[PDB]
Amino acid sequence: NRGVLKVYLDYRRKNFNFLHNSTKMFLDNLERVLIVTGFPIPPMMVAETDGPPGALAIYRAVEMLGGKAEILTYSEVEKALEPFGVSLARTPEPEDYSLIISVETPGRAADGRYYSMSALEIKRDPLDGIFLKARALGIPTIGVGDGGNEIGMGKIRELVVGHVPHGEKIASVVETDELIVSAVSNWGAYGLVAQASIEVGRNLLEGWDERRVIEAISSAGLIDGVSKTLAPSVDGIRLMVHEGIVELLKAVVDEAIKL
Amino acid sequence: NRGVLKVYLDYRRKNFNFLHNSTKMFLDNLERVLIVTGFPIPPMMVAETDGPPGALAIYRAVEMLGGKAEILTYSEVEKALEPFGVSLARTPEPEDYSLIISVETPGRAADGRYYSMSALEIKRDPLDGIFLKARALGIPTIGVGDGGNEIGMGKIRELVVGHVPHGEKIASVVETDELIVSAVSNWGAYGLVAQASIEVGRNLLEGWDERRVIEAISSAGLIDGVSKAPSVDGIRLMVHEGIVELLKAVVDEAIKL
């Protein structure tokens, strides 16, 4: 392997665990959260299955905590999320939110373009603009990504450039206050929810049906961003594996809050 | 064989198996596929049985995967494919398609003409024009051929020119993004569909009756392009059904694994 996660975990400041600060920022700014997600996969430019499940999980947590959330994403993803009854953000402006979060969303590169991990150019209307504005405004932002070309990855751009294939070209320059790097962005989101959970003594993952969420967005047309498999999946990893890690997080969370 | 298959398999770059990248381009551009086929055999100038079956198998795969397929071919081939209810190319313009595929279709040579493997000149309105336009437009193109004079063989012209009889003159200069070379073009097409089946997880060769399709187009008037019973490339019906069954069995195993 030669990905971002590998080197990031080796050379990141270890004063705290990798989710700590994102959790801190998350819990302190729940008033009105804007959650961005959606990653068009070239050449077809159809949104993938990694990101939406994560965004939905964070969405739930926000409201379970008395806050209010909205989702900013592409049309095909809005449709895939239709069955879950999530509030869709219309004409969102950064000043209207206390926190803005990106779950696996394309981030413009140094050349002003958006690239997939294979250096194929993405041609869809971008969603990172609102994040550049937030940073300029001083509005808290958190990004979750697993490759190096996502919103929030500007925070560790030298890492991507120096250890990731086509780093110079695909590494995004879009920074976020806090960044979450994982093997699967959905997991990264669930990690934040799990840590927020033990933090507030509530299991915010309770009732999360991983298999059902993936199968639903898959049915709606959302594709795997890594393989051509027609079966419901995420990043070339089978359903069994995704339900598997969700259960580990649920179980560890449950044990901790029941202490 | 003093053929192109032999040398192509020896010297093509092997970072990936020989079908891999066409399969990739195939699945990545299923929106609306124009499938071109039909190869006139001189001196009679009637289209042969190698090409149409392959096109039909890909045509079906595209539809099964939810895309739209269309066929541009000679009239005798249209009549031959009529009983299978395929949509026929409506004055095609490359811009209308996300992918253009050629299954054993004549490709112009260095001198602007079209040649059979035996070096006899083909005299029939050309069908390679649209692939030339597609390359200039950046529209995905895949070529399937077994001789070196077909649309797509321009990709390995030097190989054909230096290792195939009458190389210089018959070798096609018509290039396609991805080329599939096989002993029989119908088979190269089935290989594409089979590889696509595996990566997608569905047996796209499901229900393909190889003997039926060859007998149907043959009785429709299409001839064997090599030896001219219903056959393809001088190879007996049984052998064709045999290949298809091997591809079906291996696919079946892989998708249930």
Residue numbers in the entry:
A (entry chain A): 12 to 270
B (entry chain B): 12 to 239, 242 to 270
Source paper text:
The protein TON_0340 (268 amino acids) was identified in a transcriptome study aimed at identifying genes whose expression is enhanced when this organism was grown with CO as the sole carbon and energy source. The biological function of TON_0340 is unknown, and a BLAST database search shows that TON_0340 belongs to the DUF4392 superfamily (after domain of unknown function), the members of which are found in all three domains of life. To gain insights into the biochemical function of TON_0340 and its homologues, we determined the crystal structures of TON_0340 in four different forms; the apo form without a bound metal ion and the Mn2+-, Mg2+- or Ca2+-bound form, revealing that the protein has a highly conserved bi-metal binding pocket. Our analyses strongly support that TON_0340 is a novel Mn2+-dependent phosphatase.
Intriguingly, in the crystals of the apo form of TON_0340, two protein molecules in the asymmetric unit also formed a dimer-like pair, but they were in parallel orientations. The intermolecular interactions are also mostly hydrophobic and bury a surface area of 1,778 Å2 in one subunit. The binding interface involves α2, α8 and α10, whereas that in the metal-bound TON_0340 involves α1, α2 and α10. The N-terminal segment corresponding to α1 in the metal-bound TON_0340 is disordered in both molecules forming the parallel dimer in the apo form. The helices α8 and α10 of one molecule interact withα8’ and α10’ of the other molecule, as if they form a four-helix bundle. Probably, the parallel dimer of TON_0340 is the biological unit in solution and the formation of the antiparallel dimer is likely to be caused by the high concentration of 2-methyl-2,4-pentanediol (16%) contained in the crystallization solution that probably disrupted the native hydrophobic interactions at the dimer interface. The apo-form of TON_0340 exhibited no detectable phosphatase activity.
